[PDB]
Design a protein around this ligand. Structure first.
Ligand SMILES: [Cl-]
Ligand SMILES: [Cl-]
Ligand code: NA
Length: 160
């Protein structure tokens, strides 16, 4: 299972690798702490990388729209950045229910101007993830794909 760089990183020691976001790696040793021995799949070089800078290639952490540990207010601050159109979104962990998630979407209306709507993503015990009783999804990726086509109850369509 490959790992993917979530951010750019510049070597800080002789034994560290430098890499750009999206670069792929094979992990060789992840047992001697926060710094893992890896092989770059662009240069073939072996060295140490910060573990918090990488995630498994098919993980939720690797998704462009997933911002795990981001809070509600900082989600608003991030989506209300310049250039993000109506429908720009992100998925983050729920601050109220462990194992639940939150879908934050940039929207616009008459009373509030540019604002953000938050939708809690729950998970059924013998089922998948859902916002409505209408549909449930085995993964968060499938949920994003579903609401990317039409809003289906949501304030606006997901701009992916
Ligand atoms: Cl970066
Ligand atoms: Cl850096
Ligand atoms: Na991500």
């Amino acid at each position: 299972t490959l790992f993917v760089a979530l951010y750019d990183y510049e070597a800080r020691t002789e034994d560290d690798l430098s890499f750009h976001k999206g670069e792929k790696f094979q992990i060789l040793n992840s047992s001697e702490g926060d710094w893992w021995e890896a092989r770059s799949l662009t240069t073939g070089e072996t060295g140490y990388i910060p573990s918090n800078y990488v995630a498994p290639v098919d993980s939720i952490q690797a998704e462009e729209w997933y911002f795990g540990k981001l809070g509600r207010k900082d989600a608003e601050r991030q989506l209300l950045s310049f250039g993000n159109p109506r429908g720009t979104f992100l998925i983050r962990e729920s601050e109220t229910t462990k194992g639940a998630y939150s879908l934050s979407i940039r929207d616009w209306d008459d009373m509030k101007g540019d604002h953000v709507k938050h939708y809690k993503i729950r998970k059924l015990d013998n089922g998948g993830y859902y916002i409505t009783t209408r549909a449930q999804f085995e993964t968060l990726q499938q949920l994003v794909q579903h609401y990317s086509e039409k809003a289906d109850g949501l304030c606006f369509n997901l701009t992916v």
